[PDB]
Amino acid sequence: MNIFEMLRIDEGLRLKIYKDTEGYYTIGIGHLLTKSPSLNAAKSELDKAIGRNTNGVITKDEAEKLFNQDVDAAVRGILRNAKMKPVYDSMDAVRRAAMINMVFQMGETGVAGFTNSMRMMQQKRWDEAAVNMAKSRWYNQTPNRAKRVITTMRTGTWDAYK
Ligand SMILES: [Cl-]
Ligand SMILES: [Cl-]
């Protein structure tokens, strides 16, 4: 297991524009297209991202293409972030994967809003961090995924994904 498979589990694969769990137009493997209510704008954002006239549908390879880009951008987002970098650097590979998943889903912004857990993380107080992370809208909204990511963080193993 690795970050790619992990996220592929959590996000799924849809080759047609769909609405995510927040009602936002998405496609591929969790690629958010736009927060606007218009499918047109969505369709438009998709064509711009793919470089062709998609008509709201892409092939698998294209989905994988966005996916690579988005994982790469999440990592690079973390590394450019003054609050997060040090937390990420302090952790082992499994736990880093958990942090990337959170950023991929919530944006550097949304994650960056877990200061308190991140501090516990950096201190290696896993159980506590897990408890704190659970008091969040994130957890209340997507509890099963949240649980998977929290156990990965708590344990440093991929058990939640096996
Ligand atoms: Cl893009
Ligand atoms: Cl869920």
d(CA 129, CA 127): 6
C-alpha of residue 126 to centroid of ligand 1, in Å: 34
Q: How remote is the CA of residue 62 from the centroid of ligand 1, in Å?
A: 11
Q: Which residues of 29-57 are buried (b: 16+ CB within 10 A; e: fewer)?
A: bbbbbbeeeeeeebbebbeebbeeebebe
Counting ligands in written order, the one closest to the CA of 51 is 1
Please state, in angstroms and rounded to a whole number, the distance separating the CA atoms of residues 18 and 34.
11
| Solving technique | X-ray
Distance 69 CA to ligand 2 centre (A): 24
E-assigned strands of 3-146?
Answer: 14-19, 25-28, 31-34
- Nearest ligand, CA of residue 69? 1
Whole-number Å distance, alpha carbon 66 to ligand 2 midpoint, is 22
Which ligand is nearest to the Cα of residue 11, counting in written order? 2
| Domains by residue range for the chain, with CATH | 1-162 (1.10.530.40)
Q: From CA 134, how far away is CA 146, in angstroms rounded? A: 8
The span from the CA of 16 to the CA of 105, in Å, is 19
Instruction: Give how far Cα 137 sits from Cα of 25, 59, 118, 151, 161, Å.
Output: 20, 33, 16, 17, 22
Q: Which helix (H) or strand (E) holds 126?
A: helix 126-134
The C-alpha atoms of residue 58 and residue 54 are separated, in whole angstroms, by: 6
Q: Tokens 């949304």 sit at which residue?
A: 110
Using only C-alpha atoms, what is the Rg of the chain?
16
Could you list the active site residues? 11, 20
d(CA 91, CA 121): 8
- DSSP string over 10-52: HH--EEEEEE-TTS-EEEETTEEEESSS-HHHHHHHHHHHHTS
Instruction: Give residue 72's identity as a one-letter amino acid code.
Output: D
Binding residues, by number, are 32, 104, 117, 132
* Residues in binding site for substrate: 32, 104, 117, 132
Two tokens at 69?
Answer: 């880009």
93: nearest Cα among 149, 159, 134, 153: 153
